[PDB]
Tab-separated table of N, CA and C and ligand atoms in Angstrom:
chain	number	residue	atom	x	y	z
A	134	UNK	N	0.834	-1.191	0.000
A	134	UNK	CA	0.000	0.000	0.000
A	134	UNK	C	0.872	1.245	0.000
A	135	UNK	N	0.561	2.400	-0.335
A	135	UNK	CA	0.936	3.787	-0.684
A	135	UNK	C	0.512	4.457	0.718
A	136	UNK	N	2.049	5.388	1.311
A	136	UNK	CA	1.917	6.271	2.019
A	136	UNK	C	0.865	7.387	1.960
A	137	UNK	N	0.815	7.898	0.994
A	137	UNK	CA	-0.275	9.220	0.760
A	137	UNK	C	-1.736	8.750	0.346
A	138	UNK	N	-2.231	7.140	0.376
A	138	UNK	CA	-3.612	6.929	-0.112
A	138	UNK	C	-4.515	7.326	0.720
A	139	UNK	N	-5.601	7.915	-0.058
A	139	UNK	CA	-6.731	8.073	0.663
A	139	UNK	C	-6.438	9.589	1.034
A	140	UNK	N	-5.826	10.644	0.834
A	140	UNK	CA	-5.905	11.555	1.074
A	140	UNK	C	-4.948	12.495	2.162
A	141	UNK	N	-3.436	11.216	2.136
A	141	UNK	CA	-3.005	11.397	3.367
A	141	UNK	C	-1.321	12.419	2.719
A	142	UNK	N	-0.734	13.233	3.767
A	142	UNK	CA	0.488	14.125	3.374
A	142	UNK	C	1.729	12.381	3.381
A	143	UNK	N	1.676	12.223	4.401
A	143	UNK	CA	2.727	11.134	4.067
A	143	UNK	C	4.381	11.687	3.968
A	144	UNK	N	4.264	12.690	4.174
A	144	UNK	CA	5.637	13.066	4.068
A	144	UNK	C	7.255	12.800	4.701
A	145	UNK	N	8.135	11.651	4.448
A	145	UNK	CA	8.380	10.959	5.067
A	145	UNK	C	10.341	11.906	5.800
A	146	UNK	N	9.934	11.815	7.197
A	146	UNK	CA	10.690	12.521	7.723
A	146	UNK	C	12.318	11.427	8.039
A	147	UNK	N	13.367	12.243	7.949
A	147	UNK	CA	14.651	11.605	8.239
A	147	UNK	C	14.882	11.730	10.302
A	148	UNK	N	15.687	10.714	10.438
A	148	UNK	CA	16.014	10.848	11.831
A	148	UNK	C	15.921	12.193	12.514
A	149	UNK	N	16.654	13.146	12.445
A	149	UNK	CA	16.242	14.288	13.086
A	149	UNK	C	15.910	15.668	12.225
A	150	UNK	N	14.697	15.271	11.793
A	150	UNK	CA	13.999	16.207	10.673
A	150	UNK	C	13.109	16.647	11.996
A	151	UNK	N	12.903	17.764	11.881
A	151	UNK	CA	11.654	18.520	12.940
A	151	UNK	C	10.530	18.455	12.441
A	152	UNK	N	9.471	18.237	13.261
A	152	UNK	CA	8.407	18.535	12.747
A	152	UNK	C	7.216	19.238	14.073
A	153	UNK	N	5.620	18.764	14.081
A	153	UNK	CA	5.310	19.831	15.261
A	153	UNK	C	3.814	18.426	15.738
A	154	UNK	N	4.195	18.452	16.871
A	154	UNK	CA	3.606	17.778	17.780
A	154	UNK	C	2.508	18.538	18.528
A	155	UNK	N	1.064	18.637	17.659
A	155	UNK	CA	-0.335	19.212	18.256
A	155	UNK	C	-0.911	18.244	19.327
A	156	UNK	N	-1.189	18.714	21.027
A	156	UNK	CA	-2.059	17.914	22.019
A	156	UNK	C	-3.149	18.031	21.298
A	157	UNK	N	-3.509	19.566	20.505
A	157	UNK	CA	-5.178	19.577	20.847
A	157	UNK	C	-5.452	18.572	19.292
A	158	UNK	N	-4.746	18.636	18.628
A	158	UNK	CA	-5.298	17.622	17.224
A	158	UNK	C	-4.695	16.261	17.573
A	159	UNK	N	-3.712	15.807	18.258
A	159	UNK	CA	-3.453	14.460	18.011
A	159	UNK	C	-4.203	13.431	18.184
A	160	UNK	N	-3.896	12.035	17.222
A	160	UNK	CA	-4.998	11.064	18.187
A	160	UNK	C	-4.569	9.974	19.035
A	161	UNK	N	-3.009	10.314	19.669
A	161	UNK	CA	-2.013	10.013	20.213
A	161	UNK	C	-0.986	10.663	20.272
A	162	UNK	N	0.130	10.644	21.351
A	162	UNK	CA	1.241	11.056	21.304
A	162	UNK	C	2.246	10.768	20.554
A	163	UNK	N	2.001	9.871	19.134
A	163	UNK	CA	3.171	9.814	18.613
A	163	UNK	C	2.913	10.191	17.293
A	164	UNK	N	1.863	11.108	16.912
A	164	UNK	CA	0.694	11.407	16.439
A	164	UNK	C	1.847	12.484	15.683
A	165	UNK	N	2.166	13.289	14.320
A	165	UNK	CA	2.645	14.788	14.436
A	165	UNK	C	2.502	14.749	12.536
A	166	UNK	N	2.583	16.385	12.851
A	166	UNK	CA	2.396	16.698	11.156
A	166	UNK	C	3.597	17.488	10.650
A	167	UNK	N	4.071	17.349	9.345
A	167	UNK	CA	5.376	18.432	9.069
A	167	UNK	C	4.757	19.853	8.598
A	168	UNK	N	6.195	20.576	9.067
A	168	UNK	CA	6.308	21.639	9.271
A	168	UNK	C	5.455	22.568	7.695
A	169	UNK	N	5.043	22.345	6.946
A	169	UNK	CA	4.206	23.072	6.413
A	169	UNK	C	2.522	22.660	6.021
A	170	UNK	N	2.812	21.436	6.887
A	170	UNK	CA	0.827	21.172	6.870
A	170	UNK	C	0.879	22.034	7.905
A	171	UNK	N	1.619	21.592	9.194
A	171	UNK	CA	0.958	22.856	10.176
A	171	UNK	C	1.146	24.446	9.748
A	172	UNK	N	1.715	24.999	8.970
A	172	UNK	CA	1.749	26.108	8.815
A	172	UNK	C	0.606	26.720	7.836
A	173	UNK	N	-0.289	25.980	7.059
A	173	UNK	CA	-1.292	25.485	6.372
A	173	UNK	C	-2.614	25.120	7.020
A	174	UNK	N	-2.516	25.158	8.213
A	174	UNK	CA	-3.683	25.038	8.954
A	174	UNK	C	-3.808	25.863	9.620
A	175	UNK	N	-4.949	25.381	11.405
A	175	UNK	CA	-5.307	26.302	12.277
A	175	UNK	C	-5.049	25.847	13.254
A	176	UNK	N	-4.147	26.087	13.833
A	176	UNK	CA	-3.966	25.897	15.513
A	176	UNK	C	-3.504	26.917	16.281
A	177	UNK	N	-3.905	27.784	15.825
A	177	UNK	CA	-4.256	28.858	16.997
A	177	UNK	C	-4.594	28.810	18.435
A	178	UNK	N	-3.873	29.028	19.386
A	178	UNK	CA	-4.231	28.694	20.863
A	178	UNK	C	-4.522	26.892	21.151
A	179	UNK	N	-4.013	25.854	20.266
A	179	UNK	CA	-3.862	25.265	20.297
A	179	UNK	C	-2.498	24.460	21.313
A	180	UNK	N	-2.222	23.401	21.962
A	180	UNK	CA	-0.821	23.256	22.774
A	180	UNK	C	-0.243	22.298	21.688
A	181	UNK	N	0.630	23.310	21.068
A	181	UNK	CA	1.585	22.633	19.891
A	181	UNK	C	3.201	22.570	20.618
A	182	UNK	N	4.173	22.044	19.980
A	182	UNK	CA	5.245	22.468	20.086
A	182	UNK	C	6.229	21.683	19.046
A	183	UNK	N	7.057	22.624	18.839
A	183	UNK	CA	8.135	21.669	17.642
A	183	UNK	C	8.973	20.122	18.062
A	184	UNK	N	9.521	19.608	17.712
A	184	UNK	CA	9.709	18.136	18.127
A	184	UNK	C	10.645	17.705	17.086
A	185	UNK	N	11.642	16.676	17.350
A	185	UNK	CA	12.577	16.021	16.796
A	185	UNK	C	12.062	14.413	16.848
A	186	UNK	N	11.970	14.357	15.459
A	186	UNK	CA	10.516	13.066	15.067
A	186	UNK	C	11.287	12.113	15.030
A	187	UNK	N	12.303	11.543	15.114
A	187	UNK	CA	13.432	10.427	15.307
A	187	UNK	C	12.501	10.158	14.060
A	188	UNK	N	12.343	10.105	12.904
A	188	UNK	CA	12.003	10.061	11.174
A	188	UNK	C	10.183	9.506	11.275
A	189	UNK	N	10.181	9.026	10.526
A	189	UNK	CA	8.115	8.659	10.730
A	189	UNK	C	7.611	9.383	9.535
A	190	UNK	N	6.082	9.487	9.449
A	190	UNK	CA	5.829	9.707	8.337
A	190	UNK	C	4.486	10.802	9.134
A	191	UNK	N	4.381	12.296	7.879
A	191	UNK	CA	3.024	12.918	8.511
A	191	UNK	C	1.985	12.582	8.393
A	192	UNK	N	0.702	12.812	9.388
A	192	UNK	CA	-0.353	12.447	10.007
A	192	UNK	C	-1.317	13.229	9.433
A	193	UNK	N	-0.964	14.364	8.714
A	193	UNK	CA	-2.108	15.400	8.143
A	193	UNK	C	-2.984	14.475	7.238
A	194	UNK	N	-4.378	14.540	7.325
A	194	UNK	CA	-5.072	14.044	6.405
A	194	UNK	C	-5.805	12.692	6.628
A	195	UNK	N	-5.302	12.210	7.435
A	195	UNK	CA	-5.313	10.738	8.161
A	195	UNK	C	-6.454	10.675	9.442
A	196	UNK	N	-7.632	11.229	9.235
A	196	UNK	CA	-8.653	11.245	10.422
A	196	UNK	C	-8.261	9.996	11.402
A	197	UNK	N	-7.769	8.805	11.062
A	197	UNK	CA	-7.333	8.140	12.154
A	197	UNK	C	-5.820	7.929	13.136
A	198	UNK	N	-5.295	9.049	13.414
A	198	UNK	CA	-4.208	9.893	13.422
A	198	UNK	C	-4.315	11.354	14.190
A	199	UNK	N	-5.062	12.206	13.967
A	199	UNK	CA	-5.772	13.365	13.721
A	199	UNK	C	-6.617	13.628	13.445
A	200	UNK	N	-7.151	15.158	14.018
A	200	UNK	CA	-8.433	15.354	14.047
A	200	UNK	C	-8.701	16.373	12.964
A	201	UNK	N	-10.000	15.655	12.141
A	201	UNK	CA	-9.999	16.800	11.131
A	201	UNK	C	-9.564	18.126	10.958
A	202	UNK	N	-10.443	19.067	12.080
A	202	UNK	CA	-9.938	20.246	11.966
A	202	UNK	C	-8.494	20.724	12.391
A	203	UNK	N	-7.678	19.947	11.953
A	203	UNK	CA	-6.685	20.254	12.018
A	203	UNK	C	-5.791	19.966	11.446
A	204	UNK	N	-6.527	19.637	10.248
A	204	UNK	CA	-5.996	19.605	8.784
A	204	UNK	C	-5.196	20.362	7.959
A	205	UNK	N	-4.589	21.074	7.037
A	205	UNK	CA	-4.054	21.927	6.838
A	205	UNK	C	-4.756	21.759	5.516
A	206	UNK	N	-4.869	23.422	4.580
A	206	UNK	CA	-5.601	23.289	3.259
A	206	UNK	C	-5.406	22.277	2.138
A	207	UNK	N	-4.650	22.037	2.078
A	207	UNK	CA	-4.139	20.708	1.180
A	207	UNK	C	-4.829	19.679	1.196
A	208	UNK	N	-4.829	19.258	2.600
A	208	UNK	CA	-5.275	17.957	2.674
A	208	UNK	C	-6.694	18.159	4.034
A	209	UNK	N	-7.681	18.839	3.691
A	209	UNK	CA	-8.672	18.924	4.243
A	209	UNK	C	-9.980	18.262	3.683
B	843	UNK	N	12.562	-13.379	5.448
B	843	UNK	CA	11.636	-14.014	4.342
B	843	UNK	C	12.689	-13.816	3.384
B	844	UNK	N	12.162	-13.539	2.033
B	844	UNK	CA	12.905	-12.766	0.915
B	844	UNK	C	11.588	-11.343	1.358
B	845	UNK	N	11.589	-9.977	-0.099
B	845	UNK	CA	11.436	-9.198	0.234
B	845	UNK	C	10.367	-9.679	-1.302
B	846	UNK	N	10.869	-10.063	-2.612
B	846	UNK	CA	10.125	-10.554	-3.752
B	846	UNK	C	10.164	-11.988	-4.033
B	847	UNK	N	9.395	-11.734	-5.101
B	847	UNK	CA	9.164	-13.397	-5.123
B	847	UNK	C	8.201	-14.336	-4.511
B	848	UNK	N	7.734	-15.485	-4.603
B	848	UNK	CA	6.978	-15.956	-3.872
B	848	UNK	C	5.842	-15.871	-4.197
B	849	UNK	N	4.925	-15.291	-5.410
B	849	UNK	CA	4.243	-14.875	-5.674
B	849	UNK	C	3.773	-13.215	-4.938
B	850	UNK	N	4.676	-13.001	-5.066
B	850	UNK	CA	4.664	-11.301	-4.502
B	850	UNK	C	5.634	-10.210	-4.991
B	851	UNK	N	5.197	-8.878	-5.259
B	851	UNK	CA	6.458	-8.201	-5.425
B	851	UNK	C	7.328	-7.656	-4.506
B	852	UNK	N	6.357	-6.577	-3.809
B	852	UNK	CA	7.178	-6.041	-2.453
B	852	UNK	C	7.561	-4.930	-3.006
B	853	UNK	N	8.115	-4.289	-3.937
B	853	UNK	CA	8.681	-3.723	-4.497
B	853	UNK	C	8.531	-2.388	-3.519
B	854	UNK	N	9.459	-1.633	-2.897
B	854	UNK	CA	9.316	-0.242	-2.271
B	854	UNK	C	9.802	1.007	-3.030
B	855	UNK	N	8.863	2.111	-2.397
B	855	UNK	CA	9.086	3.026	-3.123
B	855	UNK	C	9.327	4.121	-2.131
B	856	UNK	N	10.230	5.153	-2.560
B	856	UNK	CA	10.551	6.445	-2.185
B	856	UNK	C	9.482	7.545	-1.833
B	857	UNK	N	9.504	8.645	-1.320
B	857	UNK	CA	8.280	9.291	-1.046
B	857	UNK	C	7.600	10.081	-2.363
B	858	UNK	N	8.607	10.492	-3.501
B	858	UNK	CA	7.967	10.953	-4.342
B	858	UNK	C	7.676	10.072	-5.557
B	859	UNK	N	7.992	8.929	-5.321
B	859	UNK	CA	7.652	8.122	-6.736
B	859	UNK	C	6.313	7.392	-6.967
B	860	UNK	N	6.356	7.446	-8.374
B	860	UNK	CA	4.815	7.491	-9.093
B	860	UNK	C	4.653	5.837	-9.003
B	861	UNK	N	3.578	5.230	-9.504
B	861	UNK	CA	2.868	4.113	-9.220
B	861	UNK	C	1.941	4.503	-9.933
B	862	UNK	N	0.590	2.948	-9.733
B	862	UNK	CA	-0.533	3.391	-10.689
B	862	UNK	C	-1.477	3.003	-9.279
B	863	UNK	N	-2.746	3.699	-9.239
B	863	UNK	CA	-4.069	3.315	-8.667
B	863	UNK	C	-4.790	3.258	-9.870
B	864	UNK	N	-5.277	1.914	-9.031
B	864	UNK	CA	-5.999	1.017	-10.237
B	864	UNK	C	-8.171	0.911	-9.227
B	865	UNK	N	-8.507	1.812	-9.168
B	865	UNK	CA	-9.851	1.794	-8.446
B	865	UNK	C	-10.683	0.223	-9.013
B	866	UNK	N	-10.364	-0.510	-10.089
B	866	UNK	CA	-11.275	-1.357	-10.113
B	866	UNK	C	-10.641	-2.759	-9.844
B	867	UNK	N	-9.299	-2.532	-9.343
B	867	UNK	CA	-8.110	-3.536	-8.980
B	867	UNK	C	-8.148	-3.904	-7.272
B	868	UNK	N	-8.255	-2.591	-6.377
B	868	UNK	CA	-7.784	-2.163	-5.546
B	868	UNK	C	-8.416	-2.820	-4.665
B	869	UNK	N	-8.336	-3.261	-3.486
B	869	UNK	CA	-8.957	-3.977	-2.281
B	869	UNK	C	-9.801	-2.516	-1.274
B	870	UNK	N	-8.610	-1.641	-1.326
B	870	UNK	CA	-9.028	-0.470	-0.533
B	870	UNK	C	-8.565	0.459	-1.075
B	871	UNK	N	-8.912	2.078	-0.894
B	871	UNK	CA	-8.368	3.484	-1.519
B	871	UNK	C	-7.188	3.566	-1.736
B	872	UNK	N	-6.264	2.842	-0.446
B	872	UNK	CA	-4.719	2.966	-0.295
B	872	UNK	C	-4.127	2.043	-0.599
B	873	UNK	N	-4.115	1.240	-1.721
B	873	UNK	CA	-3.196	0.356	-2.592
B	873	UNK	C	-3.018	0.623	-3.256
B	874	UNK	N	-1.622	0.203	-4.031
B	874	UNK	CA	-1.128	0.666	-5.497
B	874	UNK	C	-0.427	-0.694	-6.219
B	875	UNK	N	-0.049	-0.454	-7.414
B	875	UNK	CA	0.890	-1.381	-7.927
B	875	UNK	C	1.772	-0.391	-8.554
B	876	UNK	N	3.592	-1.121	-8.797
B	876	UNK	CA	4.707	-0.482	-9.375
B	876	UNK	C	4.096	-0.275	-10.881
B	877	UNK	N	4.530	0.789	-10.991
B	877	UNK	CA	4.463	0.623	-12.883
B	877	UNK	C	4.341	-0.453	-14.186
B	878	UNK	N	5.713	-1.316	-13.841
B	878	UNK	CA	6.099	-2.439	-13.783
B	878	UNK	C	5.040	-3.461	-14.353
B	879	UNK	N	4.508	-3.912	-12.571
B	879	UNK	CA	3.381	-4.526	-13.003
B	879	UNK	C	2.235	-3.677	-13.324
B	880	UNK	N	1.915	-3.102	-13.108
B	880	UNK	CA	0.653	-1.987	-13.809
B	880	UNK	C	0.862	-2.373	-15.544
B	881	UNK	N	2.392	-2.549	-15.899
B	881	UNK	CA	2.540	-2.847	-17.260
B	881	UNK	C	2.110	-4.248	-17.959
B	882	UNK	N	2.512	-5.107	-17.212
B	882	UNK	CA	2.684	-6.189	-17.326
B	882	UNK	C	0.723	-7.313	-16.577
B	883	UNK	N	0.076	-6.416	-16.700
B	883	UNK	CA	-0.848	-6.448	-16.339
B	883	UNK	C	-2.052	-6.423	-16.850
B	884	UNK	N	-3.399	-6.578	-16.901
B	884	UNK	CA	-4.213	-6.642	-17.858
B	884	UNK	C	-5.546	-5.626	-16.833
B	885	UNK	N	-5.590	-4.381	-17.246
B	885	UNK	CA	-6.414	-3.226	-16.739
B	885	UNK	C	-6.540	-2.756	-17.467
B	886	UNK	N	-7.368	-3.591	-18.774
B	886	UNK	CA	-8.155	-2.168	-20.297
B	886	UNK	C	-9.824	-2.193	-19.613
B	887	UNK	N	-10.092	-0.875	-19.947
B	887	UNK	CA	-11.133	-0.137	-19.049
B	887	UNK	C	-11.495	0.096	-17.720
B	888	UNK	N	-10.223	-0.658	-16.966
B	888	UNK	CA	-10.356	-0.257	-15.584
B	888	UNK	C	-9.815	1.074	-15.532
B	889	UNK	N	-10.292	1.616	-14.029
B	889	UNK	CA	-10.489	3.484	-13.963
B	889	UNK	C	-8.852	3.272	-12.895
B	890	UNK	N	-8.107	3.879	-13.913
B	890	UNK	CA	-6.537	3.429	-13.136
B	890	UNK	C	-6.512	4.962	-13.068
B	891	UNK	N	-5.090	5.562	-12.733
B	891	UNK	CA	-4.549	6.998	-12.628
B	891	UNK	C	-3.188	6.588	-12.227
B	892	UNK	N	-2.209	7.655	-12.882
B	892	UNK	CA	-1.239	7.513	-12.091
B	892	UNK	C	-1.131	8.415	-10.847
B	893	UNK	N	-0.338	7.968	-9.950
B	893	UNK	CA	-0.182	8.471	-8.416
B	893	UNK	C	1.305	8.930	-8.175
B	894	UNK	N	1.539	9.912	-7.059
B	894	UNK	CA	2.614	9.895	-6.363
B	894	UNK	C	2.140	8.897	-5.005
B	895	UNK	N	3.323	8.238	-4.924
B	895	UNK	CA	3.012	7.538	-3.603
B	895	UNK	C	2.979	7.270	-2.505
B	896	UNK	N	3.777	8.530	-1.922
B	896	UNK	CA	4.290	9.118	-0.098
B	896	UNK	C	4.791	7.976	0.582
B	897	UNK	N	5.728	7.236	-0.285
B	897	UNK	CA	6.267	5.788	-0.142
B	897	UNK	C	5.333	4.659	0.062
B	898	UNK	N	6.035	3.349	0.447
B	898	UNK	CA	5.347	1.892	0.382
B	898	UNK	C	5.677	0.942	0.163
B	899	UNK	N	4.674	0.256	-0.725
B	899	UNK	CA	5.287	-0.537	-1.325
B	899	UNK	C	4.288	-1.387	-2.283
B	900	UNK	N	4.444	-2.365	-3.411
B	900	UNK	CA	3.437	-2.667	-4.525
B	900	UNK	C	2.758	-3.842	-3.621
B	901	UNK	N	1.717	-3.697	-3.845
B	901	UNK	CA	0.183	-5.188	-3.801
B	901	UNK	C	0.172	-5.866	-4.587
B	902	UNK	N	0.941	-5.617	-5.712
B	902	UNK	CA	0.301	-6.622	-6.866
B	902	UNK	C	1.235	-8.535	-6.062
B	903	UNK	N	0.183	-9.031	-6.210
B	903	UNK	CA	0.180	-10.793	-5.762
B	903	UNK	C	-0.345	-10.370	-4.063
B	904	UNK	N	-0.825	-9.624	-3.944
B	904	UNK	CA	-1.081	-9.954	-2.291
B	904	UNK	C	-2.295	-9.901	-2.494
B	905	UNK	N	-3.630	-10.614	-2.577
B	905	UNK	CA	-4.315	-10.699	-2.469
B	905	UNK	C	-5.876	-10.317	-1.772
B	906	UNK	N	-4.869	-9.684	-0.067
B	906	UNK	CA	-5.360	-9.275	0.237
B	906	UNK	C	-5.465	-7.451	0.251
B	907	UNK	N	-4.884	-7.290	-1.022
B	907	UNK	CA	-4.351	-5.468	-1.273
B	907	UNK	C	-4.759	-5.479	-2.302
B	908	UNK	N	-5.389	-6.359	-3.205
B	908	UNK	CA	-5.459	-6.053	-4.741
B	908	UNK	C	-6.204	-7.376	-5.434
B	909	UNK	N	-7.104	-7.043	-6.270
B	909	UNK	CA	-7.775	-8.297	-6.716
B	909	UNK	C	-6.794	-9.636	-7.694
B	910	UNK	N	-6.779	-10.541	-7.387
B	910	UNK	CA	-6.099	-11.757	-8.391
B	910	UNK	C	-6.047	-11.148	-9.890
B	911	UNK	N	-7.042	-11.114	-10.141
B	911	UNK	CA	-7.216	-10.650	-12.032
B	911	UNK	C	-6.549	-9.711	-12.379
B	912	UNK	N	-6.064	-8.467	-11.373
B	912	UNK	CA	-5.491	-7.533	-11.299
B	912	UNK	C	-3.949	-7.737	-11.414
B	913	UNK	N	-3.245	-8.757	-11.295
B	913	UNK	CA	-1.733	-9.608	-10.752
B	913	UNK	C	-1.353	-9.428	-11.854
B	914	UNK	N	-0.241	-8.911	-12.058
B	914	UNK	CA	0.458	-8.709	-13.675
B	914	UNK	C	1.070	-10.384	-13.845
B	915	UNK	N	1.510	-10.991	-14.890
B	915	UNK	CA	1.739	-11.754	-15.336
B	915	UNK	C	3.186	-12.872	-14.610
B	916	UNK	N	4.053	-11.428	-13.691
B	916	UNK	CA	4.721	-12.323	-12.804
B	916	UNK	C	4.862	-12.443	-11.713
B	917	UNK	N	3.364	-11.973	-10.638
B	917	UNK	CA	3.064	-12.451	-9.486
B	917	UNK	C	1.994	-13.079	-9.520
B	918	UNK	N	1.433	-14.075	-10.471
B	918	UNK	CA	0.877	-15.245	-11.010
B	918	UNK	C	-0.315	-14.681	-11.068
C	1252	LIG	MG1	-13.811	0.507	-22.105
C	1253	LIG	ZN1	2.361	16.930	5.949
C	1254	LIG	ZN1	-1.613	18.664	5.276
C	1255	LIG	ZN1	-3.812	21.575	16.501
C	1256	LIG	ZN1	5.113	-4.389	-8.333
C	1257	LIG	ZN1	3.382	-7.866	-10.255
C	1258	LIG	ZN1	-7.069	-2.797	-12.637
């Protein structure tokens, strides 16, 4: 199966590639999206913070992962 | 195991490389097959597209990722 099916960013991060770790969207803690889905969305007053993703793949788009609204335009 | 063969491909892919979705092949939204077999394959009038694939890896011979009829000619 394909990283990005179904509507997903998939963007696949290297060992210490940053990316940003949302409490209020995750659907777990190991849960995170790269650095320009979140900049592409809304998390405003949201408890985000940047993070060193030891590599993984992004969560944007993936309702089972994340929570819709917190999608970024791309993949909403 | 091995990684091909066996009646399987396996074949992995990088985050930006193309593949085919084959919608009348497919078990679910998020399967693909390599080019390859997409070539070597028999999908006239099925509703295929090509894809980027946010990495993976090919279905074609797994049965449970992709229909039998769908199996290009050398994952049986
Ligand atoms: Mg036709
Ligand atoms: Zn992303
Ligand atoms: Zn996104
Ligand atoms: Zn958020
Ligand atoms: Zn293949
Ligand atoms: Zn094949
Ligand atoms: Zn097909």
């Amino acid at each position: 199966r394909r990283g990005s099916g179904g509507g997903v960013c998939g963007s696949v991060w290297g060992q210490n590639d940053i990316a940003y770790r949302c409490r209020t969207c995750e659907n777990d803690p190991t849960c995170a999206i790269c650095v320009p889905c979140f900049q592409n969305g809304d998390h405003n007053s949201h408890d985000y913070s940047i993070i060193y993703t030891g590599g993984g793949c992004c969560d944007c788009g993936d309702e089972t992962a994340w929570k819709p609204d917190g999608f970024c335009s791309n993949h909403k």
